[PDB]
């Protein structure tokens with residue numbers, strides 16, 4: 052083996068991880084450091100003592116400390132599992148730097164969490180972070196060597212909440228975030244309820260929703276709004292808009308996998324609408340026949356094989372035209388997709404396709420430029436060219452398109468993300484979310500593109516660690532809501548900040 056293992060007895064081993072998830076004011080029992088024993092305390096043990104450090108700046112930002120003890124080693128803060136992780140909580144005075152528990156209280160468990168209640172105050176700047184470190188773990192007065200696998204650094208954000216966590220509602224997994232703010236200020240968050248594992252269609256998947264009427268301060272209990280009925284009969288990959296008339300529209304796919312779809316046995320595209328801020332939804336309406344396949348009235352598209360609109364949000368233009376970008380498979384001989392805008396000029400009654408917007412594209416998103424042109428951002432699938440994100444422009448409200456290399460300048464490891472058109476210090480800019488990578492789904496970042504100089508900012512990492520799809524919306528009061536896939540086993544996390552918190 053990699054290490055020498057002695058033969059004079061069993062050797063307890065201690066591992067510790069500092070936490071780097073975001074936090075927000077007033078949150079309860081937030082993990083700062085996690086400690087794992089490799090085996091239970093031995094039967095003759097009487098006490099475990101844990102010594103720790105915590106800088107004054109962090110002490111001033113917390114109201115209470117705790118040692119939590121669990122039989123489970125969890126990725127996220129223990130309250131995020133809503134009781135599915137059982138734990139005991141042992142208070143520590145916030146000024147103390149050591150704590151001890153009897154072996155009987157530990158009751159054979161191996162996992163310890165130095166946790167804190169967060170106070171009401173914060174500056175939210177890049178440097179507004181919380182940290183602690185475990186300095187000693189001693190059993191019956193004998194210290195153990197500690198294996199430190201990560202430092203603690205929890206950034207304070209104006210809002211931070213995991214809205215969908217593995218296990219919630221009985222679903223094993225969650226993926227594929229979509230966020231919408233309505234004109235009345237309601238927030239709708241939807242996701243794939245990946246009930247049996249984290250894999251895509253053709254797995255059996257439901258679509259689930261939560262809604263907030265207070266700007267993300269609190270969220271309704273999750274509701275399954277489309278229920279998968281078995282393998283090859285699931286639904287997922289939601290994108291959302293609100294039409295000019297005010298109805299909410301969700302578009303999604305269901306059925307076999309994208310590469311298994313054929314003209315005669317398609318993976319289908321459906322729409323559903325809500326006229327009451329997301330409280331109720333119409334039965335899914337199949338609109339596949341407007342796009343491709345054996346029921347399509349355009350014979351030039353009746354042999355195309357598959358289509359899916361990119362999850363997250365579409366775009367409703369000032370004219371009222373409703374748009375989403377579809378990525379369409381035109382040939383069964385190649386694993387290649389071409390982008391077309393799927394649009395409706397009659398509030399969703401009928402749907403049409405633009406001319407082709409991008410060859411060898413993938414999930415693509417739209418945003419409205421200051422002058423009325425439409426910018427499209429296209430995922431780079433298959434490490435094409437210089438592994439950069441691709442862009443295109445339309446000046447006819449999405450009907451025709453031309454590649455826009457001047458907008459390129461950020462890496463795309465091959466992942467969905469989102470755009471917001473913003474004004475900052477009097478300058479029109481585009482905010483774009485993507486994982487930084489490089490070449491992996493790590494370090495969820497945002498960048499600003501300055502329209503006038505044609506240059507991208509350095510990235511700002513919002514959520515370090517494993518990070519994948521992201522969606523973003525602008526709230527009424529000027530904050531940005533950023534809804535991201537955090538972790539290798541994904542939770543969908545809603546983070547609220549203003550631009551100056553990240554870029555100033």
Ligand SMILES: CC(=O)N[C@H]1[C@H]([C@H](O)[C@H](O)CO)O[C@@](O)(C(=O)O)C[C@@H]1O
Nearest residue numbers: 227251252288304308309359413414432
């Ligand atoms: C309908 C569908 O399959 N959507 C899936 C897409 C497409 O397969 C790729 O974008 C095609 O290249 O990719 C994911 O798997 C991914 O990369 O995390 C997630 C998503 O659920």
Ligand SMILES: OC[C@H]1O[C@@H](O)[C@H](O)[C@@H](O)[C@H]1O
Nearest residue numbers: 096097098099190191192193
């Ligand atoms: O070092 C030994 C001593 O240390 C204590 O902390 C421990 O609980 C007892 O076993 C005692 O005998």
